[PDB]
């Protein structure tokens, strides 16, 4: 119903395999779980060796409830629990960060969803449900003075957060960092005030001083320096300061005030910012600007292949190259009413989308078949209850017909991922803009 | 312990799988309402370990109603009586 | 060491490597840092090893029982990663004290703090466990240091005469007959309390650190001896709770720079205002209790020369951004510019506006990144990954000789970054007049 | 009490680094994970005392990651096995 690891995958179809080694026919919870055992290295497989059920002990509990085995094997489909099943480990990861799913989490997508045929073979093996999902669990896991109060979320470290080798690049703006500096030791217009127009860039301009305080070249007192982020709580953790001052405050958006220390970088717009100059004068005092020219169109480009490993998160980019020069030059002349770093970003995205979109799209005039299925499944219904059995079974075998007919189509269809499924070049890219101009 | 259970199938297909199978002392009777399929199972004289066993294998196929079974025999409309999988394995499995 | 620590610091810690070798090792790691203290013998945190009772004997036959020797390498050694967290630590627990400065003790309470490593088993086996530790090094360290003042001094709001009697204040020059002036609109019984008028922009709070000098020594009517100055202000749910506290207390004088909050002439509570050339326009205008109890005195923008001088004065005190003192020929333009050439401000606050803009900015030509050896960095990046990403598939010996190639790099790198001292030692301490007359056009 | 432990180092070279002594009745294998590389240690009969000890150094050179080791053996990238400290001391140590 997806992609999972090759462990999941291998197992899933693993459960097919045990489907006909007894011969029944539709493949159910307890397939899937003779399909984690039998594939004996999966943390699924592994779990169950702890619980004391090798395969051995298993398929004898479920051969002792089911048994042949009519060979039958016409093409056979899941139950429709265990297609709960399924969408259930899906869940199982997305509770857990786990960006695929894997032999684990459908073992714990079984557990979650206990009503079904394997969890009866492991409530008759003695082997209660948590005891279970626990041996799972056991096999996985995670990844400061006033920081205390600060360090909620509000507010996260960008300094001691990119101490730990954690950081990438980052691309300026190098010229801009540094006017960060002059301000931000100043005893003048003390407290700089980022002003340029929205973005990105700016928030990358703070993760600046913390890359240039860290590794390390500074000067004017600012080592072992935090740079911090993002009511019932408020001035709260602000005291955990006024006691311990390694700390300037990156802020997105209010001025609770320089009562003393308070380093703070602002973000507002070219004319957000005489929002609080004109009531004055704590502006043309403590708090003082500069501004976000628009990154380097050059620099532009080799932002986003950093980023590009990261959206390579909806299929297609990674690349190409050729297929962001595009995203990047169209925008510095070609409308042309944002930024220079800003834009491209948002057209790869049109883009980042519109082809797994176009990916997934509907097959020919095939359309009236459905219409036709529609009316036989529904032929079917009525006289079921009406039985007529034969005078339908007729219609089932029917309705069936057409719909390993469609599917190979649909399935057929995947013979459109191709023509399009991370093809990527400008060719995708500028069709985008017949619209915005 | 419990000996009677009222089930619902989301399609009509779920229960001919059902019925690929082994029914065993198992008297059923299988109702339609709200367009979805209801079945209702009797079980004569079964260990409650034994029955808690065999249900579980029904709902791999279904879910369990809250259905006041007399809803049914009153406002439902049958299908098949007593031997309502045993009849379906007939008519449908090749 | 990764910065300036006293010499006990700093000798503790060369000490580490002077054990690094006295047994072979090759990397010194928190082991040696903790021999380096128990053997230096008389830092605080030597002091404290000889409390838990563990002197250098005890010590070194635990660690050499779990290294011994002793390839003489020596191929000029490094820390261990862990150490250097160890390090970087001592500076945070002692941020974590006031105290401006490292040394023994600190690098003892980091050694704790990161307790991960070979030191702290040393001890876990030396039946020491690790509070026990921190505690010893403690109780040799601590703290340092008029009724009503209770709940006032308390809230806010910075004791102005207090800040005069350790003279740990300012000049201030003066506006020395405006100060004056002061005294009379405050010795009196019908204009009571005095407000200041002028761009604000003469620092109008100079004046003020005035009095809390002369009421002190002493220059003043026994009409106002033993009295107080003190700020803030404006105008939350501490409310009349501590104003009822002061009341209470007849010897105080207050400073504002806002609202009104007026519960004027009520109690002593008697002010000093210091309000743009209108606002107090806009009060007045409130009336009449202003033009009554609160009255005005016009606030100079300095003589020029005044300017120059409140600089030097506090010259010496922006040493703190790494330039000064001097130049005095760079002062006077600081100054002198501003007075005819833009001419928006005060006489001196402008000055030392442009001596700020020039305050950091030179010390920054300092910090510039190197020749077009921007682009070397550049290069060694394309390394890492092939070695690393290599050291991925192995594609080893790959590496060994990758990775060689690599530092080859470095020291080079590192070695042409710190060639930029060089731009320090042509920039870093200069100042004169051309850095200022650049900040001037810069703003025309 | 455990003998066997899964460790993380921020850079490569540290791993380098503690290559150039001695292993010693270890058995050791290398992982690449997250871009920081982990190493996962194997002692083999020791007292607890006598690893206690021996895991204080490892921990001069790394920090002891709360990772799941199975989370490695599957979503790793090997690097090297059972032998992982005594190879990088062959192609690396001079």
Known sequence: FGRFTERAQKVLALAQEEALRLGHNNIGTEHILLGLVREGEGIAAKALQALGLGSEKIQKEVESLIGRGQEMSQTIHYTPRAKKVIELSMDEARKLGHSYVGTEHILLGLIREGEGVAARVLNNLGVSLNKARQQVLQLLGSNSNANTPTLDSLARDLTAIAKEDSLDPVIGRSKEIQRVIEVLSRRTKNNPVLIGEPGVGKTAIAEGLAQQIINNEVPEILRDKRVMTLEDRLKKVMDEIRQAGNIILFIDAKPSLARGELQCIGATTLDEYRKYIEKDAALERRFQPIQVDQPSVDESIQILQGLRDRYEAHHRVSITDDAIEAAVKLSDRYISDRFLPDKAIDLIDEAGSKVRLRSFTTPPNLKELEQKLDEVRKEKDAAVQSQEFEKAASLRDTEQRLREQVEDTKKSWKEKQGQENSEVTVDDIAMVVSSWT | ?94
């Open chain 2, 1 to 94: 312990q419990k000996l009677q259970f009222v089930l619902r199938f989301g399609d009509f297909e779920d229960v001919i799988s059902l019925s690929k199978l082994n029914v065993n002392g198992s008297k059923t009777t299988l109702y339609s309402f709200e367009n979805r399929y209801y079945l209702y199972v009797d079980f004569c004289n079964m260990t409650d370990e034994e029955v808690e066993n065999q249900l579980s294998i029904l709902l791999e196929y279904a879910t369990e109603s809250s259905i006041s079974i007399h809803r049914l025999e009153e406002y439902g409309k049958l299908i098949i009586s007593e031997h309502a999988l045993e009849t379906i394995k007939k008519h449908f499995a090749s």
